[PDB]
Design a binder for this molecule. Sequence first.
Ligand SMILES: Nc1ncnc2c1ncn2[C@@H]1O[C@H](COP(=O)(O)OP(=O)(O)OC[C@H]2O[C@H](O)[C@H](O)[C@@H]2O)[C@@H](O)[C@H]1O
Ligand SMILES: NC(=O)c1cccnc1
Ligand SMILES: [Zn+2]
Length: 288
Amino acid sequence: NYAAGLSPYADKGKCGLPEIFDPPEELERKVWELARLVWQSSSVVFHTGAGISTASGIPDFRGPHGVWTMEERGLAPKFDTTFESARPTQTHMALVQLERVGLLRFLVSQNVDGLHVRSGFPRDKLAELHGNMFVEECAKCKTQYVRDTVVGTMGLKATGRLCTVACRGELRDTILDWEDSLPDRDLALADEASRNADLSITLGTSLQIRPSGNLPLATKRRGGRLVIVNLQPTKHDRHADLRIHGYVDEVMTRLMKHLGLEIPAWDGPRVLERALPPLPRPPTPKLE
Ligand SMILES: Nc1ncnc2c1ncn2[C@@H]1O[C@H](COP(=O)(O)OP(=O)(O)OC[C@H]2O[C@H](O)[C@H](O)[C@@H]2O)[C@@H](O)[C@H]1O
Ligand SMILES: NC(=O)c1cccnc1
Ligand SMILES: [Zn+2]
Protein backbone atom coordinates (compact mmCIF):
# COMPACT_ATOMS: atom_id res chain seq x y z
CA ASN A 1 0.00 0.00 0.00
CA TYR A 2 1.53 3.38 1.14
CA ALA A 3 5.13 2.24 0.72
CA ALA A 4 4.36 0.71 -2.71
CA GLY A 5 2.65 3.98 -3.84
CA LEU A 6 5.50 6.37 -2.90
CA SER A 7 8.37 3.99 -3.76
CA PRO A 8 8.82 5.08 -7.46
CA TYR A 9 10.16 8.67 -8.20
CA ALA A 10 10.01 9.96 -4.58
CA ASP A 11 13.21 11.16 -2.83
CA LYS A 12 13.69 8.85 0.20
CA GLY A 13 16.53 10.92 1.82
CA LYS A 14 19.10 9.49 4.33
CA CYS A 15 18.08 5.94 5.51
CA GLY A 16 19.55 3.82 8.34
CA LEU A 17 21.67 6.47 10.16
CA PRO A 18 22.83 5.04 13.52
CA GLU A 19 20.65 5.49 16.64
CA ILE A 20 22.05 7.60 19.54
CA PHE A 21 21.10 6.96 23.21
CA ASP A 22 21.70 9.67 25.83
CA PRO A 23 23.02 7.82 28.92
CA PRO A 24 20.57 7.68 31.88
CA GLU A 25 21.81 10.70 33.96
CA GLU A 26 21.94 12.91 30.81
CA LEU A 27 18.48 11.66 29.67
CA GLU A 28 17.03 12.52 33.14
CA ARG A 29 18.64 16.04 33.01
CA LYS A 30 17.21 16.69 29.49
CA VAL A 31 13.65 15.51 30.36
CA TRP A 32 13.70 17.83 33.44
CA GLU A 33 14.81 20.65 31.05
CA LEU A 34 11.91 19.70 28.68
CA ALA A 35 9.46 19.97 31.66
CA ARG A 36 10.93 23.46 32.45
CA LEU A 37 10.34 24.58 28.81
CA VAL A 38 6.73 23.25 28.83
CA TRP A 39 5.98 25.02 32.20
CA GLN A 40 7.48 28.33 30.93
CA SER A 41 5.89 28.33 27.41
CA SER A 42 2.52 30.01 26.51
CA SER A 43 1.90 28.24 23.12
CA VAL A 44 3.33 24.68 22.66
CA VAL A 45 3.11 22.89 19.26
CA PHE A 46 4.04 19.19 18.86
CA HIS A 47 5.22 17.76 15.53
CA THR A 48 4.94 13.94 15.21
CA GLY A 49 6.29 11.42 12.69
CA ALA A 50 6.47 7.66 12.31
CA GLY A 51 8.78 7.12 15.31
CA ILE A 52 5.81 7.68 17.75
CA SER A 53 4.02 4.55 16.31
CA THR A 54 6.99 2.10 16.20
CA ALA A 55 6.21 0.97 19.83
CA SER A 56 2.66 -0.03 18.57
CA GLY A 57 4.14 -2.32 15.85
CA ILE A 58 4.13 0.08 12.83
CA PRO A 59 7.58 0.50 11.19
CA ASP A 60 9.05 3.96 10.39
CA PHE A 61 10.58 4.96 6.99
CA ARG A 62 14.30 5.69 7.70
CA GLY A 63 15.07 3.96 11.03
CA PRO A 64 17.35 0.87 11.09
CA HIS A 65 14.32 -1.35 10.07
CA GLY A 66 12.40 1.47 8.32
CA VAL A 67 10.46 0.89 5.05
CA TRP A 68 13.24 2.54 2.93
CA THR A 69 16.18 1.14 4.95
CA MET A 70 14.76 -2.41 4.49
CA GLU A 71 13.93 -1.79 0.80
CA GLU A 72 17.67 -1.09 0.18
CA ARG A 73 18.33 -4.70 1.47
CA GLY A 74 15.48 -6.12 -0.72
CA LEU A 75 13.43 -6.68 2.49
CA ALA A 76 9.80 -5.75 3.21
CA PRO A 77 9.06 -3.69 6.33
CA LYS A 78 7.63 -5.74 9.23
CA PHE A 79 4.27 -4.86 10.88
CA ASP A 80 3.43 -6.40 14.31
CA THR A 81 -0.20 -5.19 13.87
CA THR A 82 -2.74 -4.07 11.25
CA PHE A 83 -3.62 -0.35 11.08
CA GLU A 84 -7.10 -1.38 12.41
CA SER A 85 -5.75 -3.45 15.38
CA ALA A 86 -2.99 -0.90 16.34
CA ARG A 87 -3.39 0.79 19.74
CA PRO A 88 -2.17 4.32 20.51
CA THR A 89 1.21 4.39 22.32
CA GLN A 90 1.88 5.97 25.73
CA THR A 91 3.13 8.99 23.66
CA HIS A 92 -0.20 9.21 21.72
CA MET A 93 -2.20 9.15 25.01
CA ALA A 94 0.23 11.63 26.69
CA LEU A 95 -0.47 14.11 23.83
CA VAL A 96 -4.25 13.62 24.38
CA GLN A 97 -3.81 14.59 28.08
CA LEU A 98 -1.47 17.56 27.30
CA GLU A 99 -4.20 18.97 24.96
CA ARG A 100 -6.96 18.31 27.59
CA VAL A 101 -5.10 20.33 30.32
CA GLY A 102 -4.13 23.18 27.89
CA LEU A 103 -0.33 22.48 27.75
CA LEU A 104 -0.52 21.61 23.97
CA ARG A 105 -2.00 24.29 21.62
CA PHE A 106 -1.70 22.40 18.29
CA LEU A 107 -0.46 19.06 16.90
CA VAL A 108 1.09 18.68 13.40
CA SER A 109 1.54 15.06 12.22
CA GLN A 110 3.10 13.51 9.10
CA ASN A 111 1.58 10.11 10.13
CA VAL A 112 -1.14 8.48 7.94
CA ASP A 113 -1.63 5.64 10.57
CA GLY A 114 -4.88 7.31 11.93
CA LEU A 115 -3.78 6.83 15.59
CA HIS A 116 -3.99 10.52 16.71
CA VAL A 117 -7.68 10.63 15.61
CA ARG A 118 -8.40 7.12 17.00
CA SER A 119 -6.72 8.12 20.35
CA GLY A 120 -9.58 10.71 20.77
CA PHE A 121 -7.30 13.73 20.03
CA PRO A 122 -9.55 16.63 18.87
CA ARG A 123 -9.48 17.06 15.06
CA ASP A 124 -9.77 20.91 15.32
CA LYS A 125 -6.28 20.95 17.00
CA LEU A 126 -4.70 18.45 14.55
CA ALA A 127 -3.13 18.95 11.08
CA GLU A 128 -2.68 15.61 9.22
CA LEU A 129 -0.30 16.96 6.55
CA HIS A 130 0.13 13.64 4.62
CA GLY A 131 -3.43 12.27 5.09
CA ASN A 132 -5.15 9.60 7.24
CA MET A 133 -5.58 5.99 5.98
CA PHE A 134 -9.09 5.91 7.63
CA VAL A 135 -10.39 9.24 6.19
CA GLU A 136 -12.12 9.76 2.80
CA GLU A 137 -13.36 13.13 1.51
CA CYS A 138 -16.22 14.10 -0.88
CA ALA A 139 -14.76 15.69 -4.09
CA LYS A 140 -18.00 17.86 -4.34
CA CYS A 141 -18.84 19.15 -0.75
CA LYS A 142 -15.43 18.39 1.03
CA THR A 143 -17.28 16.46 3.85
CA GLN A 144 -14.82 13.98 5.50
CA TYR A 145 -15.74 10.46 6.72
CA VAL A 146 -13.61 8.87 9.47
CA ARG A 147 -14.05 5.11 8.86
CA ASP A 148 -13.45 2.19 11.27
CA THR A 149 -11.30 0.49 8.54
CA VAL A 150 -8.57 1.75 6.17
CA VAL A 151 -9.85 3.30 2.93
CA GLY A 152 -8.36 0.91 0.36
CA THR A 153 -6.86 3.58 -2.03
CA MET A 154 -3.94 6.10 -1.96
CA GLY A 155 -3.07 9.15 -4.13
CA LEU A 156 -6.46 10.92 -3.69
CA LYS A 157 -8.33 8.34 -5.88
CA ALA A 158 -12.08 7.42 -5.87
CA THR A 159 -12.73 4.76 -3.14
CA GLY A 160 -15.95 3.55 -4.87
CA ARG A 161 -18.25 5.00 -2.13
CA LEU A 162 -20.48 8.08 -2.57
CA CYS A 163 -21.24 11.04 -0.26
CA THR A 164 -24.41 10.65 1.93
CA VAL A 165 -24.84 14.33 3.09
CA ALA A 166 -28.33 15.92 2.73
CA CYS A 167 -24.89 14.97 -2.45
CA ARG A 168 -23.69 11.66 -4.06
CA GLY A 169 -20.21 13.27 -4.61
CA GLU A 170 -17.27 10.85 -5.27
CA LEU A 171 -15.42 9.95 -2.01
CA ARG A 172 -11.60 9.97 -2.36
CA ASP A 173 -8.77 8.91 -0.02
CA THR A 174 -6.68 11.70 1.63
CA ILE A 175 -3.27 9.92 1.19
CA LEU A 176 -0.88 12.24 -0.76
CA ASP A 177 1.37 10.55 -3.37
CA TRP A 178 4.85 12.15 -3.93
CA GLU A 179 3.64 14.69 -6.54
CA ASP A 180 0.58 15.85 -4.50
CA SER A 181 0.51 19.32 -2.83
CA LEU A 182 -0.36 19.30 0.93
CA PRO A 183 -4.04 19.89 1.92
CA ASP A 184 -4.24 23.76 1.93
CA ARG A 185 -6.38 24.12 5.12
CA ASP A 186 -4.21 21.71 7.25
CA LEU A 187 -0.93 23.31 5.96
CA ALA A 188 -2.19 26.90 6.60
CA LEU A 189 -3.28 25.93 10.16
CA ALA A 190 0.03 24.06 10.81
CA ASP A 191 2.10 27.04 9.49
CA GLU A 192 0.09 29.57 11.62
CA ALA A 193 0.37 27.35 14.77
CA SER A 194 4.17 26.86 14.21
CA ARG A 195 4.79 30.65 13.66
CA ASN A 196 2.63 31.53 16.78
CA ALA A 197 4.30 28.89 19.07
CA ASP A 198 6.96 29.91 21.64
CA LEU A 199 7.86 26.15 21.85
CA SER A 200 7.91 23.49 19.06
CA ILE A 201 8.63 19.86 20.16
CA THR A 202 9.34 17.23 17.44
CA LEU A 203 8.77 13.54 18.32
CA GLY A 204 9.92 10.61 16.15
CA THR A 205 10.48 12.54 12.89
CA SER A 206 13.80 12.79 10.95
CA LEU A 207 12.41 16.15 9.52
CA GLN A 208 13.71 15.15 6.03
CA ILE A 209 10.39 15.73 4.14
CA ARG A 210 9.44 19.33 3.07
CA PRO A 211 7.48 21.32 3.89
CA SER A 212 6.33 19.33 7.01
CA GLY A 213 9.93 18.94 8.34
CA ASN A 214 10.60 22.74 8.12
CA LEU A 215 7.47 23.88 10.10
CA PRO A 216 9.26 23.54 13.49
CA LEU A 217 11.85 26.09 12.17
CA ALA A 218 9.01 28.68 11.79
CA THR A 219 8.91 28.68 15.63
CA LYS A 220 12.72 29.34 15.82
CA ARG A 221 12.64 32.09 13.12
CA ARG A 222 10.19 34.05 15.40
CA GLY A 223 12.34 33.66 18.60
CA GLY A 224 10.58 30.52 19.96
CA ARG A 225 12.46 27.43 21.23
CA LEU A 226 12.84 24.06 19.41
CA VAL A 227 13.17 20.61 21.06
CA ILE A 228 13.93 17.52 18.92
CA VAL A 229 13.24 14.07 20.41
CA ASN A 230 14.59 11.36 18.06
CA LEU A 231 16.85 8.25 18.16
CA GLN A 232 18.55 9.19 14.84
CA PRO A 233 20.11 12.52 13.87
CA THR A 234 17.61 14.81 12.06
CA LYS A 235 17.98 17.36 9.23
CA HIS A 236 17.52 20.28 11.71
CA ASP A 237 19.67 19.14 14.70
CA ARG A 238 21.72 22.42 14.39
CA HIS A 239 18.55 24.53 15.17
CA ALA A 240 17.43 22.64 18.34
CA ASP A 241 17.72 24.34 21.78
CA LEU A 242 17.40 20.83 23.27
CA ARG A 243 18.11 17.45 21.63
CA ILE A 244 16.89 14.26 23.35
CA HIS A 245 18.13 10.86 22.04
CA GLY A 246 15.87 8.23 23.64
CA TYR A 247 12.66 6.23 23.14
CA VAL A 248 9.82 8.78 22.85
CA ASP A 249 7.63 6.68 25.24
CA GLU A 250 10.38 6.82 27.93
CA VAL A 251 10.78 10.61 27.37
CA MET A 252 7.00 11.31 27.39
CA THR A 253 6.21 9.07 30.45
CA ARG A 254 9.04 10.79 32.45
CA LEU A 255 7.78 14.24 31.24
CA MET A 256 4.20 13.44 32.35
CA LYS A 257 5.54 12.34 35.81
CA HIS A 258 7.41 15.71 36.16
CA LEU A 259 4.19 17.58 35.12
CA GLY A 260 2.13 15.53 37.68
CA LEU A 261 -0.20 14.32 34.85
CA GLU A 262 -1.63 10.78 34.37
CA ILE A 263 -1.63 9.14 30.91
CA PRO A 264 -5.35 8.44 30.28
CA ALA A 265 -6.85 5.03 29.42
CA TRP A 266 -7.73 4.45 25.74
CA ASP A 267 -11.44 3.50 25.41
CA GLY A 268 -10.83 1.99 21.91
CA PRO A 269 -11.22 3.92 18.62
CA ARG A 270 -13.12 7.23 19.17
CA VAL A 271 -13.43 10.37 16.96
CA LEU A 272 -13.57 13.82 18.60
CA GLU A 273 -14.26 16.67 16.10
CA ARG A 274 -13.83 19.61 18.58
CA ALA A 275 -11.62 20.14 21.67
CA LEU A 276 -13.66 19.93 24.97
CA PRO A 277 -13.21 22.65 27.62
CA PRO A 278 -9.76 22.49 29.30
CA LEU A 279 -9.34 20.34 32.45
CA PRO A 280 -7.58 21.40 35.68
CA ARG A 281 -3.79 20.83 35.94
CA PRO A 282 -1.31 20.87 38.83
CA PRO A 283 0.12 24.22 39.95
CA THR A 284 3.62 24.97 38.52
CA PRO A 285 6.99 24.62 40.33
CA LYS A 286 9.12 27.66 41.31
CA LEU A 287 11.99 27.41 38.75
CA GLU A 288 15.11 29.14 40.27
N1 LIG B 1 10.52 4.85 19.69
C1 LIG B 1 11.23 5.83 19.13
N2 LIG B 1 11.64 6.88 19.89
C2 LIG B 1 12.30 7.89 19.31
N3 LIG B 1 12.67 8.03 18.03
C3 LIG B 1 12.23 7.00 17.29
C4 LIG B 1 11.53 5.89 17.75
N4 LIG B 1 11.26 5.03 16.70
C5 LIG B 1 11.77 5.62 15.65
N5 LIG B 1 12.40 6.81 15.95
C6 LIG B 1 12.97 7.76 15.00
O1 LIG B 1 11.89 8.29 14.28
C7 LIG B 1 12.39 8.87 13.06
C8 LIG B 1 11.29 8.76 12.04
O2 LIG B 1 11.74 9.35 10.82
P1 LIG B 1 11.20 8.79 9.43
O3 LIG B 1 11.29 7.31 9.40
O4 LIG B 1 11.88 9.67 8.43
O5 LIG B 1 9.65 9.17 9.46
P2 LIG B 1 8.95 10.60 9.27
O6 LIG B 1 7.59 10.52 9.92
O7 LIG B 1 9.89 11.67 9.71
O8 LIG B 1 8.79 10.59 7.67
C9 LIG B 1 8.23 11.72 6.98
C10 LIG B 1 7.41 11.25 5.79
O9 LIG B 1 8.26 10.49 4.88
C11 LIG B 1 7.47 9.55 4.17
O10 LIG B 1 7.60 9.82 2.76
C12 LIG B 1 6.03 9.74 4.69
O11 LIG B 1 5.23 10.64 3.92
C13 LIG B 1 6.25 10.31 6.09
O12 LIG B 1 5.14 11.01 6.66
C14 LIG B 1 13.66 8.11 12.72
O13 LIG B 1 14.70 9.06 12.55
C15 LIG B 1 13.87 7.17 13.92
O14 LIG B 1 15.20 7.20 14.40
N1 LIG C 1 3.18 5.81 11.18
C1 LIG C 1 2.74 5.79 9.87
O1 LIG C 1 1.86 6.60 9.52
C2 LIG C 1 3.30 4.80 8.79
C3 LIG C 1 2.56 4.50 7.64
C4 LIG C 1 3.05 3.58 6.68
C5 LIG C 1 4.30 2.99 6.88
N2 LIG C 1 5.04 3.30 7.99
C6 LIG C 1 4.55 4.18 8.94
ZN1 LIG D 1 -20.56 15.43 -0.63
